[PDB]
Design a protein around this motif. Structure first.
Motif, PDB file in Angstrom:
ATOM      1  N   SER A  85     -23.024  12.422 -14.616  1.00 29.59           N
ATOM      2  CA  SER A  85     -23.592  12.878 -15.879  1.00 29.59           C
ATOM      3  C   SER A  85     -23.201  11.965 -17.033  1.00 29.59           C
ATOM      4  N   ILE A  86     -22.002  11.402 -16.939  1.00 27.09           N
ATOM      5  CA  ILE A  86     -21.445  10.588 -18.006  1.00 27.09           C
ATOM      6  C   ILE A  86     -21.626   9.109 -17.697  1.00 27.09           C
ATOM      7  N   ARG A  87     -22.287   8.418 -18.615  1.00 26.05           N
ATOM      8  CA  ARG A  87     -22.620   7.015 -18.454  1.00 26.05           C
ATOM      9  C   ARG A  87     -22.260   6.284 -19.739  1.00 26.05           C
ATOM     10  N   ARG A  88     -22.448   4.969 -19.763  1.00 26.85           N
ATOM     11  CA  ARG A  88     -22.065   4.178 -20.927  1.00 26.85           C
ATOM     12  C   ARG A  88     -22.876   2.888 -21.032  1.00 26.85           C
ATOM     13  N   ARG A  89     -23.516   2.694 -22.183  1.00 27.61           N
ATOM     14  CA  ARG A  89     -24.279   1.480 -22.455  1.00 27.61           C
ATOM     15  C   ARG A  89     -23.429   0.461 -23.192  1.00 27.61           C
ATOM     16  N   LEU A  90     -23.560  -0.800 -22.795  1.00 28.18           N
ATOM     17  CA  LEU A  90     -22.758  -1.875 -23.357  1.00 28.18           C
ATOM     18  C   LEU A  90     -23.648  -2.995 -23.878  1.00 28.18           C
ATOM     19  N   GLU A  91     -23.206  -3.627 -24.959  1.00 26.02           N
ATOM     20  CA  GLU A  91     -23.924  -4.749 -25.549  1.00 26.02           C
ATOM     21  C   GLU A  91     -22.974  -5.919 -25.765  1.00 26.02           C
ATOM     22  N   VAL A  92     -22.695  -6.639 -24.685  1.00 27.53           N
ATOM     23  CA  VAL A  92     -21.764  -7.761 -24.720  1.00 27.53           C
ATOM     24  C   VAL A  92     -22.430  -9.026 -25.248  1.00 27.53           C
ATOM     25  N   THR A  93     -22.066  -9.411 -26.467  1.00 28.22           N
ATOM     26  CA  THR A  93     -22.621 -10.599 -27.106  1.00 28.22           C
ATOM     27  C   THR A  93     -21.589 -11.718 -27.121  1.00 28.22           C
ATOM     28  N   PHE A  94     -21.877 -12.780 -26.378  1.00 30.31           N
ATOM     29  CA  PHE A  94     -20.995 -13.935 -26.307  1.00 30.31           C
ATOM     30  C   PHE A  94     -21.008 -14.750 -27.591  1.00 30.31           C
TER      31      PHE A  94
END
Length: 128
Positions: A85-94
């Motif tokens: 149910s628990i998820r996580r979105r990531l935005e890794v900007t180099f």
């Protein structure tokens, strides 16, 4: 000049700068420590396609359900190991081969809920 492995990261980096080769993610594989107290930690486990989130008592893993590269940004869709149910979105900007900036957004049940996160901030990969 720098050590061998260091150059390999810069070499690998160059292939991702304009090359737009398959894998920029390959640079993420390893330990990352937050910049700006106790530092939040990100370890991108390439082998098991996981991302471990740590801050002292806090420790947890999210399996990568998907991952996409565009220009200088890897965008992850990860999912908690215990609870689907628990998820996580990531935005890794180099910014560099050993310098990134992360934005995180939780996603419980099925609607994403996105105030500032404790994981948000600049990170630097660990090197000895």
């Amino acid at each position: 000049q720098p050590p061998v492995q260091t150059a390999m990261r810069i070499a690998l980096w160059n292939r991702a700068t304009h090359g737009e080769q398959g894998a920029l993610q390959h640079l993420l594989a390893g330990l990352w420590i937050q910049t700006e107290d106790i530092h939040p930690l990100l370890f991108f486990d390439r082998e098991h396609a996981e991302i471990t989130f740590s801050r002292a008592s806090v420790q947890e893993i999210f399996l990568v359900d998907s991952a996409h590269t565009h220009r200088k940004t890897v965008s992850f869709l990860t999912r908690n190991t215990a609870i689907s149910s628990i998820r996580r979105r990531l935005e890794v900007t180099f910014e560099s081969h050993a310098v990134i900036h992360v934005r995180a957004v939780e996603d419980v049940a099925r609607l994403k809920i996105g105030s500032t996160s404790m994981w948000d901030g600049q990170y630097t990969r660990y090197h000895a």
